[PDB]
Design a protein around this ligand. Structure first.
Ligand code: CU
Ligand code: CU
Ligand code: ZN
Ligand code: ZN
Lengths: 151, 151
């Protein structure tokens, strides 16, 4: 697929539609998430597209290369590290990311995996603690969805 | 990619969890669906893992070989044609299917696509009207979910 889509849903007020498009050796991510508290929220691709137990069953951050948690710009990051999405006072976050590590095909494709938007911001592996270089301290999983093939 | 899972959700009471496992050269599908009316219900893999408009956006049945709709045992069928699941009087349908066309990797992969359970029985393409050759007259989509990679 050169195109993918993900519908984020959770137990609370957070929902959103995320679009993915392959361009060169990058994936352009677009869309929006509504119902968010003003400010930043971690935005990551988790390993499994398993929603049997809410967003918890999605597992760890997609990390096929076995590296530590970082920000999208860092060389030392998990493939699923897409940084933070920023919500305005109205609680809407317009997503716009161009990532060079995630892919929509091949060994480490993200199709069939889970997109997760977190409760708190992602400190990009710079919080100092140990929960910083594993998840970036983004908190619980507000909404999530399995990444699917799009027309 | 040897295991996959799908959580079926809809506007109504129908829900269920479907499991997929690559065993040998085939794919074993198991699980259960609840909240169904007693009797048969179409059970298919639709082309897109797009839930932006409910089960509607999933598109037509997955059909990479460009064939007409049929039953799972027919030569002429869509790759996504898994026939009917049968609900007992308590509204529970136990899924136990092994299928020769679907796969969890490559050209026939259903990872990232949508599993749908229909309101009415699939006539296995033998209804005699044009609709039979497309959807088996299975009708509306009661519940669906994107097929994701499982641990
Ligand atoms: Cu995360
Ligand atoms: Cu169908
Ligand atoms: Zn990470
Ligand atoms: Zn069909």
């Amino acid at each position: 697929a050169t195109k993918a889509v993900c519908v984020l849903k959770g137990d609370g007020p957070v929902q959103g539609t995320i679009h993915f498009e392959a361009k060169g050796d990058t994936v352009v991510v677009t869309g929006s998430i509504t119902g968010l508290t003003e400010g930043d929220h971690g935005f990551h691709v988790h390993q499994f597209g398993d929603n049997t137990q809410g967003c918890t069953s999605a597992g760890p951050h997609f990390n096929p290369l076995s590296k530590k948690h970082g920000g999208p710009k860092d060389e030392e990051r998990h493939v699923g590290d897409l940084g933070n999405v920023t919500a305005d006072k109205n609680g809407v976050a317009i997503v716009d990311i161009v990532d060079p590590l995630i892919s929509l095909s091949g060994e480490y494709s993200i199709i069939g995996r889970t997109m997760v938007v977190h409760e708190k911001p992602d400190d990009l592996g710079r919080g100092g603690n140990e929960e910083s270089t594993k998840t970036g301290n983004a908190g619980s999983r507000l909404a999530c969805g399995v990444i699917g093939i799009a027309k």
